[PDB]
Amino acid sequence: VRATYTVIFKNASGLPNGYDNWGWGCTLSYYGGAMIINPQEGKYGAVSLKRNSGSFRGGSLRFDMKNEGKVKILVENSEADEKFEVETISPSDEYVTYILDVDFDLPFDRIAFQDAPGNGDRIWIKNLVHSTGSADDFVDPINLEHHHHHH
Ligand code: NA
């Protein structure tokens, strides 16, 4: 019952180690540790972070995000040709941390962030982690590693 946390990236200066991007309709740039998604207008651009090898199953996704528009979070199984909408996130000027249960009943090898309104709103992502356990049971190894010196 020990949860496995998989840190996908903290600060990004490029595509996460062991991942490719199998989305469309965006350009990517990296500054301030953020993966900066620039969707093109009219494309509903997505970044689909594709594991080179293996799959996650269930549990929960943790990440920081700011975004000028609504963002659709998905997981996908490449082999089964199956997508699952995890959540749609409202616009925010400031980074907000989300921890979201993945209720998909299949393994997933892809985690996607999509420009839902398709108007080209930018999206900024940092600190992407997967846990095998639930959102309520998530003990963030990222925030824990900031305050370890104190308590
Ligand atoms: Na844009």
Q: Where are the domains of the chain?
A: 1-151
Helices (H), the chain: 141-147
Method for this entry: X-ray
CA 120 to each of CA 34, 42, 116: distance values in angstroms, whole numbers, following the listed order: 18, 7, 9
Amino acid at 26: C
- Resolution as reported, in Å: 2.5
The CATH classification number of 1-151 equals 2.60.120.430
Beta-carbon contacts of 38 under 8 Å, excluding residues fewer than 6 positions away, are 26, 27, 28, 29, 120, 122
Rounded distance from Cα 91 to ligand 1 centre (Å): 15
Question: Locate tokens 């104190």: which residue?
Answer: 150
3-state secondary structure of 141: helix
Rounded distance from Cα 39 to ligand 1 centre (Å): 5
If you ran DSSP here, which 8-state letter would residue 119 be given?
Answer: S
* Segments of the chain assigned E as strands: 5-9, 19-21, 26-31, 34-39, 46-51, 60-67, 71-77, 82-89, 92-101, 110-115, 123-131
Rounded distance from Cα 89 to ligand 1 centre (Å): 18
Amino acid at 113: F
Supply φ then ψ for residue 141, to 5 degrees.
-70, -20
